[PDB]
Design a protein around this ligand. Structure first.
Ligand code: ADP
Ligand code: MG
Length: 755
């Protein structure tokens, strides 16, 4: 890197030998032939209803006047009765008592920090307060409000659209990856932090916004950490941009310092007392204990809804059916009030999200009707369900973990932090004195649980982050002003990986491939695989595989019904090719037979998750549009062609050649090309005899090291496709890999001369 790296046939240029790079160059030239247009202009309504209001000199009183008026200032329409009822209710939120104090701070500072307990009205009200003082629409801009969580962004936008008496997708909208609900009319845009990051990649100054509100900063996601850095600089280049940092942690010092001694507004807490119940003994099996305590609460405690925290969608759906079924049994057998039960988790469709806010069912019984929401930690600080009085806290969540010594992420179910435990308990005290049932000991809470979780950036593989920073035009990656810097070595490794992928050249600059990959909301390996696929004559099939990989395991395997579940899977299963299996299932899911059969019944009878398949369907559609937009041809070859499956395996390889494992000759296990790790094929797939080399999607770390979602690949293909990576010079000494790598190359040379 110091002097220009030299390349040669023995140590080749990864960019020059990248098949996907070749595709990107073809696509780039096509685009350069018909340069795509610019963003459609924003549009707004102005009939003088804002006359008399002066930007940045607004008051709560003036705003209230408009809100109290008969006609909606942002539109031309009469305010509805629904609106007025919602209006008087939300005016009770703690944030309203400080509206004027907030405006003052907003008016006199470019950056401010805003802290308050969840439920106090931060996400719903504040951005509305800003619309009145900022009148962004009259100056041709919007205001962004960023959420770490998709569900918070979607549901809160739906609510705020109601609070503003406008249509969702119009004046108030949301933007999520693969799911956009905005238009030329949108003024207030709730969105994931990931999506604003992506907007910034296209427009470094985020010129479309006059105010950016980074919310739930206390979660310290990668995306908000990056946005905080970026915005700390953008703010020097645009005096017209205002920035609000919102957080639930009444801790602000560190944030204020980071943002050049920015001022702080704190909302006093209004939470009612919450009585804490602990288990006397350690609880080995929390699910059934959680279920038991929900039913006990419902049968014995007075009115008040229940919030149960679980860990993931499968577990949650399982608990929904068990609690639902036992609830019904309690009505008929003991005369309990009705008990409604709702799931909440990351992938829920919007309609279903909205169900959690439904009133508890009325009892015609004399015993209280009651709602149970069974939620992931979305319900920890990201949103509130009015009427919760009881929380059940098993003490676990799904957390990203990184391993520097093995260089790999993995999502594990792990004990929560004490701060998280505190937040969960707090949800019980929003409306009245509540109770929180912790499925662990008081000792464990006081001495075992870690105080605070580490920021995501310190628990992350940074290959996506590096490509993003590069796209943002950041050259000095080491000195990017992170609030908590990652270890330099994780960054270096990411740069190297991106170079091998040919997204960056050896001097750290974007290639045509890197530039194009940055246009897809996908991990670099996936985007590269997709980009190159038309060069392998199978972009239609790679399209579906990438969509299928962007979604949870689709196959349902009940513990008590394994045999039939497996029978069903084998209908689609491809030997030595889990990746092909995904293609089969999706193709069948889209079949006329399936549709004729009744799609939902079809998935159920086939042990398939309709929710995941439908999400894959939408993702495929959105990806196709990107491919049309950037001129990546949609390719396929005849299924009857001896090269069909070959092409697919090769395209997979072009992206995943660094996630390859070779069959251990002596130990009858597997060894990974990168880092030389001993691993076993995950139990969920059966290896065939001719599968000496496999490409794997995932590294799973239970008690042993497993490799999951594998497809066989010919070694000569790896060498042919990624010569720079499969150069024995950088290969450590012997075990089986280098050794049999040499053998492969020998065999390959030996074949040339004869002819
Ligand atoms: N669909 C909904 N989404 C969010 N909040 C709602 C919804 N329906 C009613 N509310 C009410 O409005 C408030 C939403 O507060 P929220 O602005 O999300 O605050 P914060 O962001 O500070 O946790 C809750 O206190 C609740 O009383
Ligand atoms: Mg909020």
């Amino acid at each position: 890197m110091g002097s220009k790296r030299r390349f040669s046939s023995e140590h080749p240029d990864p960019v020059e030998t990248s098949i996907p790079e070749q595709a990107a160059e073809i696509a780039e030239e096509l685009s350069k032939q018909h340069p795509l247009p610019s963003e459609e202009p924003l549009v707004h309504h102005d009939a003088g209803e804002f006359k008399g209001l002066q930007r940045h000199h607004t008051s709560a009183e003036e705003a209230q006047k408009l809100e109290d008026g008969k006609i909606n200032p942002f539109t031309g329409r009469e305010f509805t009765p629904k609106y007025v009822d919602i209006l008087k209710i939300r005016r009770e939120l703690p944030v309203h008592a400080q509206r004027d104090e907030f405006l003052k701070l907003y008016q006199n500072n470019q950056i401010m920090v805003f802290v308050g307990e969840t439920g106090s009205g931060k996400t719903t009200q504040i951005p509305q307060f800003v619309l009145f003082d900022e009148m962004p629409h009259l100056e041709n801009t919007q205001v962004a409000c960023t959420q770490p969580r998709r569900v918070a962004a979607m549901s809160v936008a739906q609510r705020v659209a109601e609070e503003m008496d406008v249509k969702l997708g119009e004046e108030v909208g949301y933007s999520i990856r693969f799911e956009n609900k905005t238009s030329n009319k949108t003024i207030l845009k709730y969105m994931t932090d990931g999506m604003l990051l992506r907007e910034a990649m296209e427009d470094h100054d985020l010129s479309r916004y006059s105010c950016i509100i980074l919310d739930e900063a206390h979660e310290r996601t990668l995306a908000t950490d990056i946005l905080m850095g970026l915005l700390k600089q953008v703010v020097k280049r645009r005096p017209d941009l205002k920035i609000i940092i919102m957080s639930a942690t009444l801790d602000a010092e560190k944030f204020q310092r980071y943002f050049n001694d920015a001022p702080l507004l704190a909302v006093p807490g209004r939470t009612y007392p919450v009585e804490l119940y602990y288990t006397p003994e350690f609880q080995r099996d929390y699910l059934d204990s959680a279920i038991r305590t929900v039913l006990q609460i419902h049968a014995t405690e007075e009115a008040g809804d229940i919030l149960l925290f679980l860990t993931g969608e499968d577990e949650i759906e399982d608990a929904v059916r068990k609690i639902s079924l036992e609830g019904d049994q309690l009505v008929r057998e003991e005369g309990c009030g009705p008990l409604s039960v709702y799931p909440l988790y990351g992938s829920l469709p919007p309609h279903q999200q909205q169900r959690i806010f439904e009133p508890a069912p009325e009892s015609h019984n004399g015993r209280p009707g009651r709602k149970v929401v069974i939620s992931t930690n979305i319900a920890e600080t990201s949103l509130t369900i009015d009427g919760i009085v009881y929380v059940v806290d098993p003490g676990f969540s799904k957390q990203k973990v990184y391993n520097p010594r093995i260089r790999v992420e993995s999502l594990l179910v792990s004990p929560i932090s004490k701060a998280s435990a505190q937040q969960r308990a707090g949800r019980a005290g929003r409306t009245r004195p509540g109770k929180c049932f912790r499925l662990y000991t008081e000792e464990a809470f006081q001495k075992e649980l870690i105080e605070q979780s580490y920021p995501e950036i310190l628990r992350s593989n940074l290959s996506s982050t590096v490509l993003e920073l590069k796209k943002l035009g950041i050259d000095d990656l080491v000195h990017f002003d992170f609030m908590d810097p990652p270890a330099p070595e994780t960054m270096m490794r990411a740069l190297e990986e991106l170079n091998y992928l040919a997204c960056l050249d050896d001097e750290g600059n974007l290639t045509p491939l890197g530039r194009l990959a940055s246009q897809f909301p996908l991990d670099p390996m996936l985007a590269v695989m997709l980009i190159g696929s038309f060069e392998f004559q199978c972009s239609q099939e790679i399209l579906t595989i990438v969509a299928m990989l962007s979604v949870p395991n689709v196959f349902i395997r009940p513990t008590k019904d394994k045999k039939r579940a497996d029978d069903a899977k084998n209908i689609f299963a491809h030997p030595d090719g889990d990746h092909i299996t995904l293609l089969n299932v999706y193709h069948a899911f889209k079949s006329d037979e399936a549709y004729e059969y009744g799609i939902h019944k079809w998935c159920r009878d086939h042990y398939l998750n309709y929710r995941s398949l439908s999400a894959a369907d939408n993702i495929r559609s959105q990806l196709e549009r990107l491919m049309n937009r950037y001129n990546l041809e949609l390719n396929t070859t005849d299924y009857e062609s001896p090269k069909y499956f070959d092409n697919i395996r090769k395209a997979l390889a072009s992206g995943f050649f660094m996630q390859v494992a070779k069959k251990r000759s002596g130990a009858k296990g597997y060894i990974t090309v990168k880092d030389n790790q001993d691993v076993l094929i995950h139990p969920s797939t059966v290896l065939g005899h001719d599968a000496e080399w496999v490409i794997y999607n995932e590294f799973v770390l239970t008690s042993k090291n497993y490799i999951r979602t594998v497809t066989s690949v010919r070694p000569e293909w790896l060498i042919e496709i990624a010569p720079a990576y499969y150069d024995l010079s950088n290969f450590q000494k012997g075990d089986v890999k280098l050794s049999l790598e040499r053998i492969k190359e020998k065999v390959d040379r030996l074949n040339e001369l004869k002819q």
